[PDB]
Structures are given as C-alpha cells and as structure tokens.
Amino acid sequence: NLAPLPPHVPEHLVFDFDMYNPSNLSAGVQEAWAVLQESNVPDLVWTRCNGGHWIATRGQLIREAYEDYRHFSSECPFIPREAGEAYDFIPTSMDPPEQRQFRALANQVVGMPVVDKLENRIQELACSLIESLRPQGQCNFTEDYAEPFPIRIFMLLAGLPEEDIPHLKYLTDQMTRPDGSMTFAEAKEALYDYLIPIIEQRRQKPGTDAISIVANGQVNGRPITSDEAKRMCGLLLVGGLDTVVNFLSFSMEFLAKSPEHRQELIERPERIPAACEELLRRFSLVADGRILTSDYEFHGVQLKKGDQILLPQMLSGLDERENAAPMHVDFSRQKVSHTTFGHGSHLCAGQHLARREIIVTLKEWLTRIPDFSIAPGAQIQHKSGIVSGVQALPLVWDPATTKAV
C-alpha cells in the first residue's frame, strides 16, 4: 500500500522500502535493510510504504540528523505516524532542553553504577540458565535463554513479578513488531494500565527498586509527576524486554554457524569485549526516526515541516563508507564504527547493561557449551520493525563436548 507522492518529493528519490516487511528478509534482516545501501539507492530516499516517509541510508546523514534536534524532533519518533504520534515515552519523546532532566534520572536507574551493583546477579542468572540447558543437548534459544536472561534481570531490577512476563512481553512486542492484533496505542495504554497502580503504590511506600526510584525521582528542583513517572517506566520496560533479547539471538545464530569465531573467543577470552562491539555493529537491529519541525533542505533534498524521516541506527555500521567489507565479521577489526545504541542526546541510557549482558552470555555460554550448531536443516527466520528480531533459534549440541562449571 503506497501513499501517494507528496508534491515536494522528486520521483527519482522514490524507493519503496517497507521497514516492517522488507523484500529480502529471507537473506537475514541486516542483509534486507542493506539493500538501501546498494548502488541503485540514493543516500536519502522517500518510501510510500507505511504512510510515506524519508529514509537516510548513510552513517554520516544519520549522525547529522540525530545531532540536529532543532530540525529533527523526537516528539514523533516512530513510523507509522499514528505510532509516532501516540508515542509519548520519556525521555525519548522529548527534545532538549526539556529532555535533559529526565535523561539524568533515567541514567540514575539503569546506568553504569546500577550495572556495577548487578554484576554478580547477572553472572548468576546466566550461569544458572546455561547449566540448566547444557545437559539437554538442545534448546530454542530465543525462548529458552535470549528472553528469560535479560528479562528476568530487568524484572528483578524493576521489582516486578516474573509471572507477568508473558503478558508484558507480548504488549512490548506490539509496539516494535506488531502482530496486527493491536495498534501501537492499545498496547501502550495496556502497559500504562499495568504501571499506573504500581507507580501509585511506590510513591506512597517507596522501595529500592527501579520503579520506586523513577516514581520518587527529582527532576529540575521538583518531583517527577505520576504521569511523567508512568511514561518513563513504560520506556524502561520496553528497553528491558525487547532489545538485548533480540540482539542475543542474532549473535548466537552467527556463532552457531561459525566455529572459527567461537574458537577465537574460547581461546582468547580477552577479545570478547572487542568481539561484542563488532557483533553490535554487524547485527545492529534498531531503527526509529524523527519529525521535521520546519521546512529544511538537508543534503540537497527539501524536507517539509511535518515530514517523518527514518534514521536507521542499524544502517550506520553497515555503511561501507564507515566500515570496509561491512557484512564480514572480524573480531580484530581495526576501527569498529557504529551507532547501534543511537547518537546525539538520546544515545541509549541502558548501553552498559546491554554490553554486560552480552559479554556475560558470550563468556559463560562458550565456556559450558563451546560446540553447538543450528538444528539440522532448520531455517532461521528474522522479523523486522522498530527493533528487529529472530523468530526462532533451535540449537543442538553434544553435551559430552560440553563442560560443567
């Protein structure tokens, strides 16, 4: 379904990419998005899919647009417009200077100091999960580890009951990769309906959990409001439930298929943090955007006030102008350039948590299950959206070749 071309959009800039179902998805979702970087596609294009919006395809343009909040506002950051309009999460729906007091609170709850405190718990949950799985010689990685590991950590941090995960996880996914069963707004309001009473409970009798801390936070010489607390906690949930979860699967699918890269990390565990960064570049997975606050000419293209522009975080590290042989995974890549965690004032507040979760997974998995592969003949299917994902990841291994810790 192609929305008719706006008058200011030249025909030669039309490239009808569908971010929710790209044509070459079978090849892998990063491969599919990478068609935007083939020689036939201009650096900045208009797609008529999903209501009609711009797409920047190059690292340099993506970075520039993310720095320039004056022209490119976060107020409406999702495609389609209906989602972007309904999107009211804090701090990401705000531009500076208003954004700044809230970002600092968010940093306080999921930032590095909190990760440092959680190190042992992170280690423990990973080891316990992996030790439980090891004697099986098989798992569906997405549901047996990729989901429970970072989600149980977040749920613990947020002080929310684990029994609520299936319901909460379902709703989160409707905001990033919708079933078609709910609109973005329904899912958001459902999440909000869950949060509202808890936030009230924790303003009256605060705890030490992340939600108590947000709800009782100080921003700008005043306490956060109940509704502001609600909008920040909703975003923290989504970050906790639908980011690392998907990334781990892209990484493990790759490792399962490439024993040499596994052996590299097994024999040289000191290369794991470097590997994690390269994996973050190659299997980048997030794409949101901004909305034009005024008419603006950007790299020779006129944008009209109210135009939406998708600025795919995924695309920067896959840009050959940024990394030679971008689809090639090289753990000793001299300069790993990417914007997987974003760019400008909205750069991911949870990046340290993500990195810790990844590096711990890489270390403890390869230690206990050094040798594994994708199940015989099984076809790996990726899913595309605001955050991309892996639908299923069946793995098999000989437990004899596995090592108990």
Ligand code: HEM
């Ligand atoms: C590999 C994992 C992750 C990736 C790739 C990722 C990606 C991103 C990106 C691209 C942005 C900026 C979006 C924009 O500019 O519109 C962002 C922001 C944010 N992320 Fe992450 N994220 C990850 C993990 C997490 C985790 C685990 C949390 C923990 C709750 C989290 C919490 C947040 C928050 C609160 C923001 C908003 C910061 C602001 O608006 O100032 N993220 N993330």
Ligand SMILES: CC1(C)[C@@H]2CC[C@@]1(C)C(=O)C2
């Ligand atoms: C784009 C994101 C990855 C970032 C954290 C969750 C997410 C979906 C957002 O709405 C902000």
Ligand SMILES: [K+]
């Ligand atoms: K909005």
